[PDB]
Every structure is written in structure tokens, then in C-alpha cells.
Amino acid sequence: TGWEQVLKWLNENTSKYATATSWWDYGYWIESSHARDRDHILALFLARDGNVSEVDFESWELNYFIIYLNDWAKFNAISYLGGAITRREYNGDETGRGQVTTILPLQGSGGIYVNPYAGISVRVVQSNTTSKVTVNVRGRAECSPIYTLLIPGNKKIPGNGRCSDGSPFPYVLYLAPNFGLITYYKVATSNFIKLAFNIPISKYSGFTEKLYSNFVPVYGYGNVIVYEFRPFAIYRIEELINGTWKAVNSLTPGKHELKLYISAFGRDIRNATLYVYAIGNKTEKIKIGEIEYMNHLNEKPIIVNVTLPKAEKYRLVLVQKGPVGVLTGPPGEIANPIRIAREGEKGTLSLKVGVDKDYTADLYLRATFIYLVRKENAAFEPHMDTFFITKLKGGIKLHKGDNVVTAELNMPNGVISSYKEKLEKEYGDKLIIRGIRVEPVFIAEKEYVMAEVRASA
Ligand SMILES: [Ca+2]
């Protein structure tokens, strides 16, 4: 399976207060040895592609994203929750009517493939003069995919999208040398496909290169892969050599003029400071530059000149304010920590917080709205809006481990009510609120890791 072995890792390898998430699974039986609203957002990440899928995971203070290949079996549920497909395509109405299989793995050495359970067979003639892909159903009858992508050859083979009986066959095929994959056209380039089966295809330009930099694999045992989440990361480094930008593989010591291709996943960059760690005989950190602001939906390359000391490795990091610390307590007020105080409620708020470094942080009360809007046979787009209600204390010195501060300031009455009706005036009817969260969070100058580059010459 892989869950127990992966959880053996992440216990000695990762930090004490390192948060992690995955899609809900029964593997939780060792994970204990979730939230129905954040499900829509997780599914929004897994089932979708490009800008739309760019979920603010840093708001959750996420450190690791664990993907699980077998979750293909649940992808119908994920797609529908992610806004990719309609109700009918998930289950349909009563006996009959089109239900869709969003993902269907194929076993086979190139180039025959087969799924023993559904009866599907796949022949790839790959010949001259006839390059074609044919999908036997073991039924009625012969189908032709929209197109078939070849991995790693990246050759795309066009098809009808039709069936032998003229019926529609809206599936994109993905053929690797050892395995195949039949995926519905609405999820053909989902992030899950990218991260689980390492199929680097996106509908949007340069997006996969970015994603793979924001989600770095640091472990992976069975059908389970552990990804280190990096909201801000460098996905390409180029150096100006002879008046020509040439892509860097390794950074030699000395003077360099680097073009840094930066990917900001889920959230923008606000007043940042760029650093480089020279990891050799000692950790000397040289500040390379700064970033005033970079929109995370339309990122752009950053040119920086830099002298590099002799070291075994280089760690480019970025520093800016962000959510630090976890709730190591329950937390007078007690009450649910994902909704600690309904509008217009006073008292105290005794909470304890676990941290891994020393932060001079401030304390806000954050509002998180997770909702749905009907865009269609019904299909719902998940939204997650985030905004600081009020500030509590600052600046408090949190040192490694647990910390306790009093914390007490009132929740205004009108805020989340007015916003809950600021959405309702905007949408229908179309609106479906799935989660209302009010939480205490600590914001401090946090060190985000962008990339690690080896040295040479
Ligand atoms: Ca982005």
C-alpha cells in the first residue's frame, strides 16, 4: 500500500509541527495509529489545471502534499468536487444515462495495453504508413480517442473522438512504456495526473514546469508520493553567457548574472527579500535581491547579479510575511479551533502554539469562506476567499516549541454576515456555502525555500 512506510518517514525526517494533507482515504487507519469544506478546495487542486487550480495552500500553512495513485479510483468523486464535471457524469440519473470514468489505468508493455476489469484493450500500430491508436471495448465496439499522447516520446496521435457505433468517445489516452491511462477529456490535464503518474501535460503554457517546482518529491514508497510544498519556488535558472541566456544546471563560484524564473503558487509576493545560502564548510547567506510585488497569476522572470562563495551546494530562499505556527492546544473560551468565535463574542482566548524557529509574530483573526457557484447537469466552481478580520497582539516572541499568550479581542458582528450576503447579492441560487472558518493565525517574516542548485568547476 505505502501509507505506513510513508508515515514512518515524515516522523523522523520532517519537523515536529509540519502540517501535511492528502485526499481522504481509509489509509487513515494507520494515519491515526480532514474537513468536508476543504475537500472542495483540495479537489479544486487535484482535478483542475492552470490558474484555476492554483489554491492558496500557504493559508493552511501546508508543508507536505501526499498524493496516492490509487486515488484514481476516487477521481470521479474528486473531479465532481473540484468543479471539473457534472453530477450526471459522476453518477447520472437513475438506471442508465451517461456516467463517466474520469481515469482508467492500463497495464501493458509498449505498445499493447489492457485493463482486465473494464474489458478495455488498446492497440498501437505505430507503423508506416499507418500511425493509429485503436481501443477495443470488448463490447460495442471499437473506439477512437480524441488523441493519444506517447510518454516519453511526447508524440501526439490524433483520433476521431468517435465510436464504432458512431457514439461519442471523449477520452484522451496516455501511453507510457510500462503503463497506459484512459482519461476523460474534462480531466485530461489535471494536476493529479501530473503528480501521480508523472504525466507532464498541461493545457496552459509553462504551467507544468512551474507546478513541478512548487511540488518537489522528497519521498515515495508504494503508490504513495510525498511532495514538499513550496508556494514560491524557482523553476528555471539561466545565466548570461556570451550575450546569450543559457540554462543553468550547476552554479560555479564567482560572478553570475542569473535569470530567475519564479513560480508563485496560490498567492502573490508581497515585499520580499531574496537570499542565497552557500552550503559548504559553513552556512553563509548572501542577500541577492528583493521583490516589491509579483502577481501569482502572471509571474515574470527576475534578473539578479551575484557573487558566489565556494560551497558544496546553494539554497535560494525568499523571505516575507506568512502564517507561522500550529495549534498544539485544545485551545475559559475553549471551543472549536476552526471557528473559535461567532460574531459578537467576548472573553479571553487561551491558546498554545508550536513553532520550529524563533519568530517575532503578530496575531490576527482570519476569515476563510469556502463556497460553490453553479456554472451549469449541474457543475459547481469551488471558491476559497481569505481576509483578516482583526488584529490581537504583537509583536510576540515565539521560541522553538510551545508558547502561550493571553489573546483577547472581540469579533465584530457585521463582518462575516455582511460578507455572507455580499456573495449572495453577487451569485444566486448558484451559491452553496460549504465552510465558514474563523481562526487565529500568526504572521511573521517567514523563510520560504525556492530552489537548491549544486556546484561545480
Ligand atoms: Ca502561479
Q: In this structure, are residues 214 and 233 in contact, taking their beta carbons and an 8 Å threshold?
A: yes
Q: What SS3 state is found at 308?
A: strand
Resolution attained, angstroms: 3.1
DSSP 335: -
* Amino acid code (one letter) for 439: E
- Which residues have CB under 8 Å from 206's CB, separation 6+? none
Interatomic CA distance for residues 387 and 378, integer angstroms: 29
* Grid cell of 432 as nine digits: 452553496
Interatomic CA distance for residues 106 and 119, integer angstroms: 10
DSSP 426: T
Across-strand partners of 245? 240
| Ligand 1 centroid, distance to 214 Cα (angstroms) | 9
* Amino acid code (one letter) for 269: I
Beta-strand (E) ranges in 230-358? 232-241, 244-247, 254-264, 269-279, 283-294, 302-308, 313-324, 326-327, 351-355
Per the annotation, binding residues are: 54, 264, 296, 299
How would you class 295 by CB atoms within 10 Å of its CB: exposed for 0-12, middle for 13-18, buried for 19 or more? exposed
| Ligand 1 centroid, distance to 309 Cα (angstroms) | 31
| Number of separate helices (H) and strands (E) present in the chain | 8, 27
| Ligand 1 centroid, distance to 264 Cα (angstroms) | 5
| Ligand 1 centroid, distance to 226 Cα (angstroms) | 21
Interatomic CA distance for residues 92 and 69, integer angstroms: 25
DSSP 138: S
| Ligand 1 centroid, distance to 323 Cα (angstroms) | 19
- Which residues have CB under 8 Å from 396's CB, separation 6+? 360, 361, 362, 363, 403, 405, 442
| Ligand 1 centroid, distance to 262 Cα (angstroms) | 9
| Ligand 1 centroid, distance to 402 Cα (angstroms) | 34
Q: N- to C-terminal Cα distance for the chain?
A: 43
- Phi-psi region for residue 154, left (φ > 0), alpha (ψ -120 to 50) or beta? left
| Ligand 1 centroid, distance to 348 Cα (angstroms) | 39
Q: In what order do the strands lie in the sheet with 401-405?
A: 326-327, 351-355, 401-405
| Ligand 1 centroid, distance to 230 Cα (angstroms) | 11
| Ligand 1 centroid, distance to 212 Cα (angstroms) | 12
Nearest partner of 442 among 330, 357, 341, judged by Cα: 357
| Ligand 1 centroid, distance to 55 Cα (angstroms) | 9
Interatomic CA distance for residues 457 and 455, integer angstroms: 7
| Ligand 1 centroid, distance to 11 Cα (angstroms) | 30
Interatomic CA distance for residues 329 and 432, integer angstroms: 32
- Which residues have CB under 8 Å from 107's CB, separation 6+? 113, 114, 115, 116, 179, 180
CB atoms < 10 A from the CB of 436, how many?
Answer: 17
Q: Is-cis flag, bond preceding 166, omega within 30?
A: no
Domains and CATH numbers, the chain: 1-100+189-230 (3.40.50.12610), 101-188 (2.40.128.390), 231-322+445-457 (2.60.40.3020), 323-444 (2.60.40.3030)
Q: In this structure, are residues 64 and 57 in contact, taking their beta carbons and an 8 Å threshold?
A: no
- Which residues have CB under 8 Å from 230's CB, separation 6+? 213, 214, 215, 216, 265, 448, 449, 450
| Ligand 1 centroid, distance to 296 Cα (angstroms) | 4
* Amino acid code (one letter) for 274: L
Parallel, antiparallel, or unpaired: how do β-strands 20-21 and 351-355 relate? unpaired
| Ligand 1 centroid, distance to 265 Cα (angstroms) | 4
Residues 98/99/103/104 CA torsion (nearest 10 deg) = -90
- Most distant pair of Cα atoms in the chain: their distance: 79
| Ligand 1 centroid, distance to 430 Cα (angstroms) | 27
Q: What is the CB-side half-sphere exposure of residue 37 using CA atoms within 13 A? A: 15
| Ligand 1 centroid, distance to 244 Cα (angstroms) | 26
Give Cα separations from 267 to 21, 203, 214, 250 (angstroms): 18, 21, 12, 29
Interatomic CA distance for residues 235 and 237, integer angstroms: 7
Using a CB cutoff of 5 Å, list residues around ligand 1, an ion.
Answer: 296
What value does the CA radius of gyration of the chain take, rounded to a whole number of Å? 25
Per the annotation, binding residues for Ca(2+) are: 54, 264, 296, 299
| Ligand 1 centroid, distance to 49 Cα (angstroms) | 11
| Ligand 1 centroid, distance to 298 Cα (angstroms) | 7
Q: In this structure, are residues 27 and 3 in contact, taking their beta carbons and an 8 Å threshold?
A: yes
- Give DSSP secondary structure letters for 82-131: HTSS-HHHHT-SSSSS----SEEEEE-STTEEE-TTT--EEEE--BTTB-
Q: In this structure, are residues 125 and 163 in contact, taking their beta carbons and an 8 Å threshold?
A: no
* Amino acid code (one letter) for 161: G
| Ligand 1 centroid, distance to 134 Cα (angstroms) | 37
| Ligand 1 centroid, distance to 314 Cα (angstroms) | 24
